[PDB]
Design a protein around this nucleic acid. Structure first.
Lengths: 305, 73, 83
DNA sequence: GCTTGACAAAAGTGTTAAATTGTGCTATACT
């Protein structure tokens, strides 16, 4: 077919819908094959290979079981599609909705119970709907939001729609936080989570074919004037420290990690010069008041920022 | 494309006699129905069906409502 | 100031991962290949608190008792004996 | 020039409670 969904519908339509008696039939075969498998698997541990005729028939019970599971599924594929139709346009592709429903359909088959005497579509509808809605919460947003948060965002929406109809207006943050039994500050934080991103490849203004993306600055880009002045600042400090003593400057450099880039603690500097941390604290205060001396500081003033 | 204008007049169910009746002085009107190999009002609706809904096997219930639902509805 | 460890994925490939020497080398590392890899050194320390996933049999067992399965199977094989 | 002890702020660690997050499930019948 021309379309992709039209192609999938063609093949799901080639199967026949079961009646109540058949569903019960397949259900038995599925459980029969599973137990036949678990029992034979129990033999693998302790051996005791079965007779020839008893082994060939057990291998068929299992094969007939999986043939049942596959037939029960293929017969109910139409049900998944019927439920997925209503959840389109909400941010998921129709086929993805179908496939996720198929995942739910599979578990319905695994957990379905035929002794309850209920039609299959009654129990499977729960899983297929949950599988589809659970899927949307995990995939429909570029920036994923966990299920419990997607649960509140929706609830807040209906409250706003119901509150919208009773007040002939949109409710304010206080009315919404009241109807939902939450703090107004919370409803704001929630309304920020619900925001969805926009496309950088979008065209801002059909008038001028200007793509939004190319209007975005690079905040982390290197600024030439600053890096050059910073290089000049780095030189001016080298000179100012030349006025200080060999140990005065040596402690200043290690204290702020000018050479290594790794600052050092008072005790660690006292470990290279062989003194206590307090002595280094003292040498620090004096060299700092020396740097504060206007002769050395006047040159560095213009580097405030 | 690939549609003989006469085949659809058979899709509605009008018999060839009415074609010679209504067409009248039209020369190509008569010459086209003689050229078309479609026989029957329900068979022309099928030649119109598979080309409009390719890939879908039709049904007498869907082939007839196809034309009406497309325009008349 | 780095120590290099080597891991081997399940399919044979091997990858070099530079670490800091002062750090404790992990026994497994998500590799550039996309699979888990095992250290080629001593350990190999742990089983990593694994629990088997849930299977179709489990879901069937929690509803049908083992006896109910036997009779249903007896129904099926007897139907097979009739030919 | 430097060291010692008292000391409090600051920084890490380990231990717990609160919170956040993932997953399973819902049986009139509905294709």
């Amino acid at each position: 077919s021309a379309d992709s969904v039209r192609a999938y519908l063609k093949q799901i339509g080639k199967v026949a819908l079961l009646n109540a008696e058949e569903e019960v039939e397949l259900a038995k075969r599925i459980e029969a094959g599973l137990y036949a498998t678990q029992k034979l698997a129990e033999l693998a541990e302790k051996g005791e290979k079965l007779p020839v005729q008893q082994r060939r028939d057990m291998q068929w019970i299992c094969r007939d079981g999986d043939r049942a599971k596959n037939h029960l599924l293929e017969a109910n594929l139409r049900l998944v599609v019927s439920l997925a139709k209503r959840y389109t346009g909400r941010g998921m592709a129709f086929l993805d909705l179908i496939q996720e429903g198929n995942l739910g359909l599979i578990r319905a088959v695994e957990k379905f119970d035929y002794t309850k005497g209920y039609k299959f579509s009654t129990y499977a509808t729960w899983w297929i709907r949950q599988a589809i809605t659970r899927a949307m919460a995990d995939q429909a947003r570029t920036i994923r939001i966990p299920v419990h948060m997607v649960e509140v965002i929706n609830k807040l929406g209906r409250i706003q729609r119901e509150l919208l109809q009773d007040l002939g207006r949109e409710p304010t943050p206080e009315e919404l936080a009241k109807e939902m039994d939450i703090t107004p500050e919370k409803v704001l934080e929630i309304q920020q989570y619900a925001r969805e991103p926009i496309s950088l490849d979008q065209t801002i203004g059909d008038e001028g074919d200007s793509q939004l993306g190319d209007f975005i600055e690079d905040s982390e880009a290197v600024v030439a004037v600053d890096a050059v002045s910073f290089t000049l600042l780095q030189d001016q400090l080298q000179s100012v420290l030349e006025t200080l003593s060999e140990r005065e400057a040596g402690v200043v450099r290690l204290r702020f990690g000018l050479t290594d880039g790794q600052p050092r603690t008072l005790d660690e500097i006292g470990q290279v010069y062989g003194v206590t941390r307090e002595r280094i604290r003292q040498i620090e205060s004096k060299t700092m008041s020396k740097l504060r001396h206007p002769s050395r500081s006047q040159v560095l003033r213009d580097y405030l920022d | 494309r690939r549609q003989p204008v006469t085949v659809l007049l058979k899709a509605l169910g009008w018999t060839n006699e009415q074609i010679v009746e209504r067409f009248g002085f039209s020369e190509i009107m008569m010459g086209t129905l003689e050229k078309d190999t479609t026989s029957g009002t329900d068979e022309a609706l099928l030649d119109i069906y598979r080309k409009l809904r390719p890939g879908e096997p039709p049904t007498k219930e869907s082939a007839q409502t196809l034309l009406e639902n497309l325009f008349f509805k | 100031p780095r120590q290099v460890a080597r891991y081997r994925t399940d399919n044979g490939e091997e990858f070099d991962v530079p670490f800091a020497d002062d750090a404790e080398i992990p026994g497994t590392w998500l590799c550039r290949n996309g699979l888990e890899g095992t250290l080629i050194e001593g350990d190999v320390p742990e089983p990593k608190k694994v629990k088997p996933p849930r299977t179709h049999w489990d879901m069937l067992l929690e509803r049908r008792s083992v006896e109910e399965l036997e009779e249903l199977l007896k129904e099926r094989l007897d139907l097979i004996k009739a030919k």
